[PDB]
Design a protein around this ligand. Structure first.
Ligand SMILES: C[C@]12CCC(=O)C=C1CC[C@@H]1[C@@H]2CC[C@]2(C)C(=O)CC[C@@H]12
Ligand SMILES: C[C@]12CCCC=C1CC[C@@H]1[C@@H]2CC[C@]2(C)C(=O)CC[C@@H]12
Lengths: 125, 124
């Protein structure tokens, strides 16, 4: 089933799910033995339980998430630029990563990696 | 590798494509680096092949421009950009996202360029 059209749709779904705080729908996009490496450089989380815990932890504050450019999708991989916004104690932060998804034949994500650093975290005092 | 180093290297890449400075591009890479253009394709490997690649890439003048901030962390960077060229009166703009991994010496050990057909923007 995996096509560039499918992978683009999955990226759009992943954004929508984060927006909604929908753990079931985020985790559903992943293969059972997938990895999540967030940020790049950290120990990968491996398999459904670990992936759900990771997203649960990321979702404790409501996130407003938005693609900021066209999805790049080719072969069996996709990359996307987006922002994740949240508020805590009256301060708004906007984080701007680039994520990479690798997909299996069935169109499930087998690996996510998220590149961002301190310069991509935008907050006032 | 500081994020500032890796960000600067990305800007150097962009500047050297703009300037058609083939030395300038190839110098960013490790001895034994790979370039995958597009992501799904067999990589060019080693200095000679990487140079050949970029020589072919510079047959037409290119206009290249970062379209967002660089993301750099650990020993890796990713960047959203455009590269435009003009051929027989038509302009094409390709909008990839590229990934570089850097070695301890701060040289690029791999590039991948992720763009698909929907990232190639051209009229008639
Ligand atoms: C995990 C995450 C969402 C899922 C995704 O795809 C990419 C990211 C990267 C930035 C994370 C964010 C979740 C909320 C985080 C932890 C913050 O409060 C600061 C950094 C930010
Ligand atoms: C300019 C380029 C080679 C010549 C013909 C067509 C091309 C399209 C996409 C370009 C490629 C050169 C290298 C490039 C700028 C990347 O680093 C990503 C997109 C590539």
């Amino acid at each position: 089933m995996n096509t560039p059209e499918h992978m683009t749709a999955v990226v759009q779904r992943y954004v929508a799910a984060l927006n909604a705080g929908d753990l079931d729908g985020i985790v559903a996009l992943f293969a059972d033995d997938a990895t999540v490496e967030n940020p790049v450089g950290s120990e990968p989380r491996s398999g459904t339980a670990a992936i759900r815990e990771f997203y649960a932890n990321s979702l404790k504050l409501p996130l407003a998430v938005e693609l900021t450019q066209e999805v790049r999708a080719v072969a069996n991989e996709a990359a996307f630029a987006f922002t994740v916004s949240f508020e805590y104690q009256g301060r708004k932060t906007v984080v701007a990563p680039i994520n990479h998804f690798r997909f299996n034949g069935a169109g499930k994500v087998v690996s996510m990696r998220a590149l961002f650093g301190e310069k991509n975290i935008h907050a006032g005092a």
